[PDB]
Amino acid sequence: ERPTFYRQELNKTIWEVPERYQNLSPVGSGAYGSVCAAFDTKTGLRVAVKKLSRPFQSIIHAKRTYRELRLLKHMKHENVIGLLDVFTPARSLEEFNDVYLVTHLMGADLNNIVKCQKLTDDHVQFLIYQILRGLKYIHSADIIHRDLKPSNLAVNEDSELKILDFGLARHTDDEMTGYVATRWYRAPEIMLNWMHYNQTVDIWSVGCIMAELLTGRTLFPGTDHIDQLKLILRLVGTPGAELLKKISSESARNYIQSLTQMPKMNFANVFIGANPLAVDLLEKMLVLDSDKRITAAQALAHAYFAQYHDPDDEPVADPYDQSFESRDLLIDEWKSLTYDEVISFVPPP
Ligand SMILES: CC(C)N1CCC(c2cc(-c3ccc(F)cc3Cl)c3c(c2)N(c2c(Cl)cccc2Cl)C(=O)NC3)CC1
């Protein structure tokens, strides 16, 4: 049941894809690979296809390819980017060297659409509800996104939202330096490596996104790591004794204690004119001590989402086995595991 493949060149890249996929049009290329939009004649869906760039060129890249395929194959939720299809034109492991990943075409991200704009409260409710719905699912599988920001939120013309580009990290030091959106949505404990982080980092990011949707302004647009920390602590207060103890980094703990203590600000005086329920939720997400932040499951039940919340339609995921992360395998071993995952793929019903 191997489909028939056909070939075409799009901006200097050869795409070899099953006949079902028609009207391929490039959207972009980079180190990540190449993306096109297409129409899936079999399902009637508008799709986006990612062709991975050299996916087995080093041990690190082979493992990265396996990691992404595993994550995308696991995710089956309305608010999370998952796989409609995955294919290779290769007929054997020996000739296997290209991976194509098919998902829904959303066509924009939240950053490209609403940057610098203040959204209506009902609009923010719908957008944040969807993010939290997807996060409840992701977190239930013990997956951490780690890099949630407006540009990682795929959105269509009806403001329907799917979370993408996650569980994958892994930014360079340069990319996180200076006046950059790559760092503005990061929880302080991960930005400054205070301690072993967990899924609560994502809730901080949601707080930062929500604030920005409500105001049209970046919440913590730091010019560098330290400037950003100062912006954060001005809003949420300096750490107390309880949190200082949890900062397992001696150097980081020492630095924090050099700062003049500041109390948490009144969020009602920061977010002037906002829905008091939005203000309440922001206070519960933007807690310095990650242990004390609201979870996605808890936030869904918050009164702010009364119009959207349905406890019978906020599903959880199967557990996700990431034991492979602890393994040092050879290129050909990662490649074989990836091939097994490609060939074992079963499409959605
Ligand atoms: C961080 C940079 C390097 N990265 C930004 C995201 C890009 C990107 C990747 C993927 C993707 C993800 C997983 C998968 F299995 C297959 C695919 Cl194609 C999609 C999109 C964008 N978009 C999209 C958006 Cl969000 C805005 C405009 C146009 C388009 Cl096509 C979709 O609509 N659907 C899927 C890839 C490059």
CB under 8 Å to 333, separation ≥6 — which residues? none
Ligand 1 pocket check for 86: Cβ under 6 Å: no
Q: Where in the chain is the domain with CATH 3.30.200.20?
A: 2-107+317-346
Residues 145 and 190: their CA atoms lie apart, in Å, by 12
Q: Where in the chain is the domain with CATH 1.10.510.10?
A: 108-316
Residues 156 and 143: their CA atoms lie apart, in Å, by 25
Rounded CA Rg of the chain: 22
Reduced to 3 states (helix: H, G, I; strand: E, B; else coil), residue 242 is helix
Could you give the angle at the alpha carbon of 234 between the alpha carbons of 228 and 235, nearest 5°?
100
Mutational pocket test of ligand 1: of 17, 34, 47, 50, the residue with most ligand atoms within 8 Å of the beta carbon: 50
Could you give the angle at the alpha carbon of 314 between the alpha carbons of 311 and 77, nearest 5°?
170
C-alpha of 267 from chain center: 26
Q: How many C-beta atoms surround the C-beta of residue 94 within 10 A?
A: 8
Catalytic site positions: 165
Reduced to 3 states (helix: H, G, I; strand: E, B; else coil), residue 299 is helix
Resolution number, Å = 1.8
- Give the residues across from 8 on adjacent strands: 15
C-alpha separations of 83 from 42, 76, 168, 242, 327 in Å: 15, 8, 16, 43, 25
DSSP H stretches of helix in 4-160:
59-74, 110-114, 121-140
- The response to whether 32 counts as a known ligand-binding position is yes
**Would you state the torsion angle of the CA atoms of residues 132, 135, 136, 139, taken in this order, to the nearest 10 degrees?**
-150
Q: What are phi and psi of 98, to 5 degrees?
A: -135, 140
- The response to whether 31 counts as a known ligand-binding position is yes
Architecture of domain 2-107+317-346: 2-Layer Sandwich (3.30)
- The response to whether 35 counts as a known ligand-binding position is yes
Reduced to 3 states (helix: H, G, I; strand: E, B; else coil), residue 20 is coil
Residue listed under structure tokens 């703990």 = 253
Q: What are phi and psi of 248, to 5 degrees?
A: -80, -15
Q: 117 C-alpha to center of ligand 1: Å?
A: 23
Is residue 136 within 8 A of residue 297, CB to CB? The reply is yes
The domain defined by 108-316 folds into Transferase(Phosphotransferase); domain 1 (1.10.510)
Strands 153-155 and 108-109: antiparallel
